[PDB]
DNA sequence: CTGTATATAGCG
DNA sequence: TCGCTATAATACA
């Protein structure tokens, strides 16, 4: 150590995976997250894609420093003030990695039928070259990376997909230039009966 | 022969 | 039960 990483690498891809918490501690944090996080509803839970509007197949929330905003798929989200459980996770991640963050996005999947579609994390408000930290609690779910040049009907090349399960209590670091080159998603898994909560920490420009 | 870009439907 | 397809109504450069 101080930590033990599994490195995930391939053309233009640079990420790393590790387990931060044991089962007892991870169960405590999950219960506190279910008690305290406030999720967006109604008009703040609909997006526009290919000209049509949809309610998102999951629940979402945003927290962070004053003044920042976060915009994607026709939806603009404003961040709530930091709370203790979220400050504790942020500080632990900063200590382990040496990086700093001023914003967090939270996604909750109620069972295996809740999911999220393919995309890159590259909006203008992200500081150039900064990393993104992904922390998970609850049921294990499969996570998938796909190369931009390999997408669609007859693509330019065919780079193999990269798949890994994200377990209860784990951290995935996504480093530059991962998000200029690769899309990611969380597909439907019908045999999964229990809920999962995911947190992604970021550096946002004012 | 030729602009690039983005949640569910309807298959197999 | 899992995964590829074809959007669709614009907004750019």
């Amino acid at each position: 150590g101080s930590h033990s990483w599994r490195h995930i690498r391939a053309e233009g891809l640079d990420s790393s995976y590790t387990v931060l918490f044991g089962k007892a501690e991870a169960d405590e944090i999950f219960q506190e997250l279910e008690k305290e996080v406030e999720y967006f509803t109604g008009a703040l839970a609909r997006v526009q894609v290919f000209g049509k509007w949809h309610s998102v197949p999951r629940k979402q929330a945003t927290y962070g420093d004053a003044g920042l905003t976060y915009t994607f798929s026709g939806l603009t989200l404003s961040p709530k003030p930091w709370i203790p459980v979220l400050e504790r996770i942020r500080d632990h991640v900063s200590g382990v990695t040496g990086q700093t963050f001023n914003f967090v996005l939270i996604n909750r999947y109620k069972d295996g039928s809740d999911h999220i579609g393919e995309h890159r994390d590259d909006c203008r408000e992200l500081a150039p070259g900064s990393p993104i930290a992904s922390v998970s609690f609850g049921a294990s779910r499969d996570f998938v990376f796909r190369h931009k040049d390999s997408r669609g009907k007859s693509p330019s090349r065919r780079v193999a997909v990269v798949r890994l399960p994200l377990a209860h209590g784990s951290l995935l670091m996504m480093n530059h230039p991962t998000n200029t080159h690769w899309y990611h998603s969380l597909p439907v898994r019908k045999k999964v009966l229990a809920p999962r909560v995911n947190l992604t920490f970021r550096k946002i420009l004012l």
Side-chain angles (χ1 to χ4, degrees):
Chain A
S2 83
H3 254 256
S4 164
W5 300 93
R6 176 196 163 176
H7 301 298
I8 318 292
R9 299 206 263 262
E11 190 189 306
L13 196 192
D14 184 5
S15 300
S16 295
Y17 175 85
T18 198
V19 179
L20 299 175
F21 307 110
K23 173 153 195 296
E25 182 174 11
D27 284 349
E28 283 178 37
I29 296 169
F30 176 80
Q31 293 299 141
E32 183 161 31
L33 291 168
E34 295 280 86
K35 170 188 187 173
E36 307 288 342
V37 179
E38 296 182 295
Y39 292 95
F40 288 118
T41 67
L44 297 170
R46 299 178 61 80
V47 295
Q48 181 188 41
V49 176
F50 273 93
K52 290 194 163 163
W53 294 87
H54 305 270
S55 290
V56 293
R58 62 187 175 274
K59 294 183 169 181
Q60 309 182 303
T62 59
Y63 287 75
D65 294 356
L68 315 170
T69 57
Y70 187 74
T71 303
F72 71 99
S73 311
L75 176 63
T76 292
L77 261 26
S78 287
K80 291 164 169 76
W82 289 100
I83 53 167
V85 64
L86 299 175
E87 272 172 329
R88 274 180 272 115
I89 302 161
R90 180 197 68 200
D91 289 345
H92 189 67
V93 179
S94 292
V96 177
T97 68
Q99 312 292 314
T100 69
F101 308 91
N102 67 350
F103 182 93
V104 60
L105 170 70
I106 305 171
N107 282 288
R108 178 186 192 279
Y109 308 87
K110 79 183 190 305
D111 61 26
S113 68
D114 278 3
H115 60 278
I116 184 166
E118 294 200 332
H119 65 286
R120 292 182 291 177
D121 281 318
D122 63 6
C123 41
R124 279 201 312 162
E125 55 270 56
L126 284 154
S130 60
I132 296 179
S134 177
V135 188
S136 311
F137 298 94
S140 179
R141 290 287 296 268
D142 293 328
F143 182 93
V144 185
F145 277 119
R146 179 185 312 276
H147 193 275
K148 93 201 170 221
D149 289 343
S150 79
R151 296 206 310 149
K153 186 164 170 193
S154 51
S156 177
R157 299 148 66 204
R158 268 198 294 274
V159 196
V161 161
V162 175
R163 342 172 115 103
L164 65 149
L166 306 175
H168 183 53
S170 66
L171 168 67
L172 180 70
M173 287 299 284
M174 290 169 276
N175 308 314
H176 186 74
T178 291
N179 277 104
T180 43
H181 299 312
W182 292 76
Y183 291 72
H184 62 267
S185 68
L186 201 85
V188 166
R189 290 286 181 266
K190 291 288 192 178
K191 302 177 160 65
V192 179
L193 299 178
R196 170 183 186 258
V197 174
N198 181 74
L199 304 95
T200 58
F201 298 89
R202 308 149 182 269
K203 297 200 90 188
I204 307 296
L205 290 171
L206 185 65

